[PDB]
Amino acid sequence: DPRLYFENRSKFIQDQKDKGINPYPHKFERTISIPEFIEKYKDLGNGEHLEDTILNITGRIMRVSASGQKLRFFDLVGDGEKIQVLANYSFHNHEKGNFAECYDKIRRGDIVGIVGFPGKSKKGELSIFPKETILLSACLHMLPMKYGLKDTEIRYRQRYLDLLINESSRHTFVTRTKIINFLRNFLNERGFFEVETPMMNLIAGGANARPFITHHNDLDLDLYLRIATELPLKMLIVGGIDKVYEIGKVFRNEGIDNTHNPEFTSCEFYWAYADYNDLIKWSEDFFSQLVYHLFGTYKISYNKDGPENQPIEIDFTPPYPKVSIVEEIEKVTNTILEQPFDSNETIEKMINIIKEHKIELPNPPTAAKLLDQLASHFIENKYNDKPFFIVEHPQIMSPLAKYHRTKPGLTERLEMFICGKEVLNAYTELNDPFKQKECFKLQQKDREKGDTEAAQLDSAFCTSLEYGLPPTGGLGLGIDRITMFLTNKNSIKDVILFPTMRPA
Template identity: 40%
Template sequence: MDNKTSNLLDIRKEKINELKTEGISLYPNDFKPDHRVCEVKDIIEQNAETLGENGRKFCLAGRMMAINKMGKSSFVRFQDAGEQMQVYIQKNKVGDDIYALFKKLDIGDFIGVEGPLFQTRTGEWTLLAESFRLLSKSVRPLPEKFHGIKDPEKRYRQRYLDLIMNENTRQIFKKRSAIVAAMRRFFDENGFMEVETPMMQTLPGGAEATPFKTWHNALGMELYLRIAPELYLKRLVVGGFEKVFEINRNFRNEGVSTRHNPEFTMVEFYQAYATYEDLMNLTEEMFCDIVTQISGDTRIEYQGLTIDFAKGWKRISMIDSLSEIGGVDPAIVNDTQALLAHAEKENIQIAKKDRHGKVMTKLFDALVEPKLIQPTFITGYPVEVSPLSRKSEADPELTDRFELFIAGREIANGFSEINDPEDQYNRFIMQVRQRDEGNDEAHIMDTEYVEALEYGMPPTAGEGIGIDRLVMLLTDAASIREVILFPHMKNQ
């Protein structure tokens, strides 16, 4: 805390003690506003003729953001849920005692006011206070109005101040809420049922990632925060819920960056009697619907790029993308050693012991992914990197899987599911071998899930979409921390 803030804090504490001595209630809980500022603004727009000093009265509450004291009268600008309104307070209207109390208050304090509206000489609709109350006394001073909070570190650690001072931040999280609501409506309108599955699991499954571990005292057992809900959602398909979705948290013990947070939000959904191609069509429709609702157009601006979500997204196999987009000679795509040599030439770090599918995928990550700006589905992922995806009938080395890329980053991952329990067991065995070879993120054997498949699962396709990254796109946010209310940070 700097000296200026420390001095202001001392002054406020002295003022609070004075108010207490005078018997002023600093935190009453009996004031009930009858309108919000946004509602009053709607009334002004639609029924201004009913307003005026002798017209309708309003009871409002909010945080004082600016005070202009002028002797026996003052103007105050207060904020309610991000919307601001002006109040005019006169000593002869509210009385000597109340006006004396008002003059002792500070920016940041919550007030309750009641009275009619009038227009100032500049035409601004203003509430004329006939009564005035202190509702909550702030102790710490807000940041300076004209500077706000620019330091990202402070904004993320003290998001409440960021929300008070920065309108853009408030709009990001309002839009995030609208995006999630639009997604829920889409699933509901398409016959999906929303469900909840365990966040603490006995085995970490559904993705290749390092989990967080915890311990359950009563059960005397180790548990893992889930890295994905996939294997539980597919158990529900086995149980007869044929179209399900879940919007909730996943946890992965990985690094923090502009694209990664250890705790993040995803939607996963599963549909019986569907294929990965059906889900690509559904995803196009859903994104187009959400973007149009949120932005009013299928086109958005993201970090200087114009991205068009109109239907007709590009679809290309990983193999073809390596040559057409990544510049890899098509003649070497199926040659592991040649790909490793190409990677070395491009200064791409790939372990020589990696299998062909892993080598191909790492080359894709480096050479192709950053160039996928417009919505693009990449299909035909290798079996080695797709432990839960159905094998392609055309090429058993590949899977019926896609990933969606927009603005150079992965947004969604989907595939036709394995419903052959023997095939799934063998894929888990393959993953166990990879763990033995040093891949700590490889999938753990889950015999209980295999047992569920043995009861029979219909042909099914499933998909996961990163909601944080989608919100980044639709709010033009460069960092994932801008769209998560309380991102993880190192201790100060």
């Protein structure tokens, strides 16, 4: 019973203190790490001992067994690697205490420090042969086995148990950090300058989403958490930082599911004198090279339908297909979506397409939401075997994107999808301040109908446009979703160390 277990262990701690022993020593000076130990002594022969080499090593005990009264065996793990501990009565320093009393105390989970020599057992298992083993920090609960952590929510609420017991968990999070490292180096090598912009602002603009609100007490001031980094980054382009980017958290106050956590990690970059076509190329270069950097090939396996179903192969070899959103919806639905797309007639037509196909009506049935819903069900799963771009979005869906230089009513916008999930959003940046105020005014008229995700107008941002924003191309990436596909995860909670959870 776990509860009695914990109580006996706590009593043990107290009783050890009462006898004069410190169960939590301040410092043990380690000589070698467990990965270093494996590298150095892997080449030893079966049964070879180096008894003149005395080492101080630490780690977490993960298995306890005995062979008689003079032999105790353990697994010792550290930094994701494992060695055996072979405690023989014949090598024990009896001046430190009784052998059996010393090792009877150890439990699965204890952190220990060992003074001993390296070698391999007769079977051939690389081992540390202790002369003395010291408790550094007890595990007071029973550690679960892999089956206890398998199909549970414990991994999200006690991530440390997952990291200790599931080898795949460590690897997922190492890949996540490698992906971010690769992206930072990719941009820095191309002259980009990393900055930090405020997470708390008077307005939350740069995307269409409901924000979190907070309050600064001394200023008696309500502030919004940022939903995107787009607006202050473009003001820095005005300021002459012509290649600027930010990798950090944004906050969106909306529904939670397998591809939505309320805080998530984005990268946005802004590139003065680039356009749509440079951004398409950047995306293909970046994703193809990232995948090759991680896997040595451009093709990966992904269990789109979970581990109980067949996986699919995703090929990141460029180029990727491009699909124009309005043209394709018109072809697949056999309708003509007349401009203005936000006219009453086009809105009624899109509603009827949705109702005819038994699709859910967006809670406010705005033209921009109607089109999004249509693309979701008719386009975004056109390709699963390769990423692809949906391109040339209407201006009503894209209030900060520059008008399309040859197609009226559209913009120079691209979104990349992997397995039906949006991972990238980019466009030629709107830089005419007179057209920008018009877009914000139209977004206000859409807010008046009950749209809580209509981005609010930023007076400071519009003012910065009046000092001259050069022609610019900007791009944003969803780091968590990218990591999901590159670690074979179906849930954003599997690639975030501490996902947003209700209290226990």
